[PDB]
Design a protein around this ligand. Structure first.
Ligand SMILES: Nc1ncnc2c1ncn2[C@@H]1O[C@H](CSCC[C@H](N)C(=O)O)[C@@H](O)[C@H]1O
Length: 225
RNA sequence: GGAUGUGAGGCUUCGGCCUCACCGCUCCAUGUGCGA
């Protein structure tokens, strides 16, 4: 009924109505081929699986907070069939990526070359506030190996307001937020996170203007310092 | 003998500088020698 995490169970039916995901013309295959990739908030995994079966990542992990979407994603694998060969290169896991303590975030070790954070920032922001959003951002940086990339597709602030009444906590967080999407790039490249450069890749096309969101690349430097 | 480009961010004493990411890590000029 209410989908307070953005955990829609019919999501791609209205994001990509009978059509290709326009982000696949913007994401580049060379970002993924032979790489270890984490897909945050993968939902029922349509985009996760398109990448895993076409662009040959050595490992693709789809993470979502909602176990019912993860079960669906596992059941969606069969629709993409013809160690590094799909479907052996993809796995799904249920979990909340937002850790509840800073020391848990600082314990994160690098495991991935690419982290996808697509259409997730709004939901983390509303449910866990600035603090939870910053914990996700810092954990992503620590999760990436040197040379890694964060692919960030953030929702605009103008789109938060219609969801603010989902729960009292979300409503509370909405009116407490001070780090707005327009400041994400500055925060991600600050010493609190540590990405060393970023670029706007493109804004994909979509049937709905509400899904035409900018896609950014945030780079973790190849040098140790 | 000639040729070092692009982007984002930050700084600047307006000369530039710094970090990262790209793009390359090569192309061009050139015999009054040689004739298997
Ligand atoms: N803290 C969290 N940890 C993991 N997944 C989360 C999360 N908060 C929200 N999500 C998931 O994020 C998804 C947002 S919808 C975006 C889906 C997908 N990334 C795409 O862009 O196509 C939902 O599936 C929701 O369940």
């Amino acid at each position: 009924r209410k989908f307070q995490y953005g955990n829609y169970c019919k999501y791609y039916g209205y994001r990509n109505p009978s059509c290709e995901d326009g982000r696949l013309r913007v994401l580049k295959p060379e970002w993924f081929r032979g790489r270890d990739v984490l897909d945050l908030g993968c939902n029922v995994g349509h985009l996760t699986l398109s990448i895993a079966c076409k662009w040959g990542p050595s490992r693709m992990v789809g993470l979502d907070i909602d176990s019912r979407l993860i079960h669906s994603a596992r059941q969606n694998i069969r629709h993409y069939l013809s160690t590094s060969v799909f479907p052996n290169n993809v796995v799904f896991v249920t979990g909340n990526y937002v850790l509840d303590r800073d020391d848990l975030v600082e314990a994160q070790t690098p495991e991935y070359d690419v982290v996808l954070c697509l259409s997730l920032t709004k939901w983390v922001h509303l449910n866990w506030g600035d603090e939870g959003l910053k914990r996700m951002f810092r954990r992503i940086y620590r999760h990436l190996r040197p040379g890694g990339i964060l692919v960030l597709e953030p929702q605009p602030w103008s789109s938060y307001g219609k969801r603010k009444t989902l729960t009292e906590t979300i409503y509370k967080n909405y009116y407490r937020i001070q780090l707005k999407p327009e400041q994400f790039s500055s925060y991600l490249t600050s010493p609190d996170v540590g990405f060393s450069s970023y670029e706007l890749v493109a804004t994909p096309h979509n049937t709905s203007k509400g899904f035409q969101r900018p896609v950014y690349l945030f780079h973790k430097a190849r040098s140790p310092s």
